[PDB]
Design a protein around this ligand. Structure first.
Ligand SMILES: [Cu+2]
Ligand SMILES: [Cu+2]
Ligand SMILES: [Cu+2]
Ligand SMILES: [Cu+2]
Ligand SMILES: [Cu+2]
Ligand SMILES: [Cu+2]
Lengths: 333, 333, 333
């Protein structure tokens, strides 16, 4: 059966961008092939130079967004180069069995494996490393991403009418627990393992030191702000593999929101803020109506502005005074 | 096109009360004018005289609930008198563009401004101050409220049938982060500015020292309990501009609940407890069936009974023994 | 009216198991009688021998799951033996009035009472102890459980079609706040009262020391794993009377989920992870498709693997290669 299906090799693109794909499946079920290389590396996560030992899928935090269609077969070739120090694996929340595939993909440095699973359920799911015994350590070190299993007929609204996005962005939110000394100074380590004991202790506090989008504070701001234009329909895939988050686009709304990211369910309309539970990936659909800067944040303002969970959207177009206008600009009474 | 619309000036009421308004709109779209004066002031939040420098809209925490209908234009005159010391502005989650209006309403002490926006989406929304650089500080200082945008044809239940409320109450939940000294005693400051450095440190722990309704522990209890009678349909608007909450009516339920506050979505039925994400406003509809005292709480019992998130409802009427009764045991058949 | 109704006595079972019941009602309304004895006792919650004074309903944490049909009358005889030292009561989120029954059920050691209430709304609900003044303390000491009110015609899917489970398990999640000394060593006390002052100080941190399923770390692991077979439809009722949780079945999903547990609402399909707000009980329906070990966890992985919120499912049956297969077993590059 499988021996007969057409295969397609996909070339991944780094977040917040997504690889080429069709919203509406143009062919029948296929075997979509992906290859990802694990990479342990030092990452500066804020302006003050705080450094950590990140464990990543394909060199990024989060790992790249993988897109397939319902009933396609995902075949992932996972490589763990001998330059790494730890054993890793991969568990897909979209798969059924073997701990999401984690029990069949344990690879030590210098090893690789190829797993195949059927994407039987449509929606955006989280995937993360989950080694027996150090699950939370690998996930909170950035070893997680997301996979989108689109319905063969694309997205539909609350009434079943097709929804087509012009742009799609992937925002992976990551909660970090960086160890500190007595004074409050962040620790630095030579290798990941050296950091383990202090890491566990920091994690148990349940209070992150950093909460960031795309691997670093301000990673999606300035020259890296997400772009769009008035009239464009944008889909924002947001994931959090360990902690709850409440996404909010300041100045806009979530026209169609699948807070828990599962497409067979009708979307919630006109959301100002929605809650995505830890270990879940959700999606929001919006059409820009006003130009200018928008802030995409975690609506716990402390977590957004103090801890780093804030990004930007730079939108181009003409201002609509009907929707909003300054009747009297600020001036002395 | 707008000059042909009727303009009406509304006087805001202090929470938990709401100004008069029609659930089913009797007129076509209008320009509803509101005026709010910013007031920075000391506020006693608990029985132990703990005092803070509250930053308020119209002198209260939360600010008053504004009610308009879908497609009406909201025209707000925001005044910042010279007696204040900080720059403030206003961001509406109901508005489209310019950071919710925040970018267009920055007013220094002694300034004022008038903003207008079209309420294009029905539901209850959060509005809060959001100054560049000190967003979480103004919000956790009580500078937030809500605005309800009623569908022109009123509320509808899961099956499109009319839902009419006899009473409406606005409950604004506020998380405070008061700084303490080495022992745990709450600090007092002369001006808001003086508190700033300590406030930031307190916020970063992500652990509130108080969580209150209507700005103080027990603000909604005793002589201030919310009232109703058996048979009355009551709508309870609940907002939390920065932190998750999970409302619950002890001894009752939320017959029709819009946990994320957007009316185009069908309500959730028979809710015991619902989650309202931080940065969101929600609404619950319930018909009282039993007289007595009811406790309205944030169902993280520690937050309700230790930190302050608990209020009362005093309902009058006749007891229904078929619903509940203390059993008398003189029988075997 | 009640006098002429059929009465059926039911002997409760210890969690994760549930007493015998019918999904679809074969009779009209009934008076279902239950008896619960309150037991204050020492409990060891972790592998390190940590001990606490648990306050239980029927000797377990959580209390047994009670199951009735919509419109049945629940008659509960609550006994507080003279061996206990504290006053207790019970509050059902399923009942209407008198604070869910708490106002009618206060019993000191040596007293008992019988409460009757109509189960007017279908769904799974939380019930817990709530003595005026020490609510959080009693709930966090393990005094909570859940009651399931089935629609008279059983469960239905999104399209109104019948849903029949073959097995039902009850998982009560508990957040514990064990007091610690200067070094971080857990305290031990002679009686519940001795622990009060410290317990309050530990609760106010809002940070659990333990978060466990069925009363202790590993209560649902090893020889205690929940069991099923490929092809069986399982319903997992999950409750959390005080804090938010986000269940997830690693290697599986929630085919039909009632996150907030109220059956008049349609279930959410294909959930990977769902949020159950504190003070709520939810239910997930799943049909096992692959054999092997599955981990049922709270998807805040730190909470699951460090604090204790993790359990197992051992499923029997034949492996399905179409759903998942290891194309190339881990091997040296
Ligand atoms: Cu790993
Ligand atoms: Cu997972
Ligand atoms: Cu302000
Ligand atoms: Cu906001
Ligand atoms: Cu008790
Ligand atoms: Cu309760």
């Amino acid at each position: 059966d499988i021996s007969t299906l057409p295969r397609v090799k996909v070339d991944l693109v780094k977040p917040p961008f997504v690889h080429a794909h069709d919203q509406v499946a143009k062919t029948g079920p296929r075997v979509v092939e992906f290859t990802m290389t694990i990479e342990e590396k030092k990452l500066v996560i804020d302006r003050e130079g705080t450094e950590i030992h990140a464990m990543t899928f394909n060199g990024s935090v989060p790992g790249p967004l993988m897109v397939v269609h319902e009933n396609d077969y995902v075949e992932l070739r996972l490589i763990n180069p001998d330059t790494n120090t730890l054993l890793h694996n991969i568990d897909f929340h979209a798969a059924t069995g073997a701990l999401g595939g984690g029990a069949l993909t344990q690879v030590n440095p210098g090893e690789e494996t190829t797993l195949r699973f059927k994407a039987t359920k449509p929606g955006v799911f989280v995937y993360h490393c989950a080694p027996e015994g150090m699950v939370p350590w690998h996930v909170t070190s950035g070893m997680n991403g997301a996979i989108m299993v689109l319905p063969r007929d694309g997205l539909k609204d609350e009434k079943g009418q097709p929804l087509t996005y012009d742009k799609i962005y992937y925002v992976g939110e990551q909660d970090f627990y960086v160890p500190k000394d007595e004074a409050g100074n962040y620790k630095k380590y030579e290798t990941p393992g050296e950091a383990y004991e202090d890491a566990v202790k920091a994690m148990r506090t349940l209070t992150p030191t950093h909460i960031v989008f795309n691997g670093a504070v301000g990673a999606l701001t300035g020259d890296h702000a997400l772009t769009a234009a008035v009239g464009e329909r944008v889909l924002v895939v947001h994931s959090q593999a360990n902690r709850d988050t409440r996404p909010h686009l300041i100045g806009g709304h979530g026209d169609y929101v699948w807070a828990t990211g599962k497409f067979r369910n009708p979307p919630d309309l006109d959301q100002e803020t929605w809650l995505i539970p830890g270990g879940t990936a959700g999606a929001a659909f919006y059409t820009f109506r006003q130009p200018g800067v928008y802030a995409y944040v975690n609506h716990n303002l402390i977590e957004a502005f103090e801890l780093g969970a804030a990004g930007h959207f730079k939108v181009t177009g003409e201002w609509n005074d009907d929707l909003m206008t300054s009747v009297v600009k600020p001036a002395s009474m």
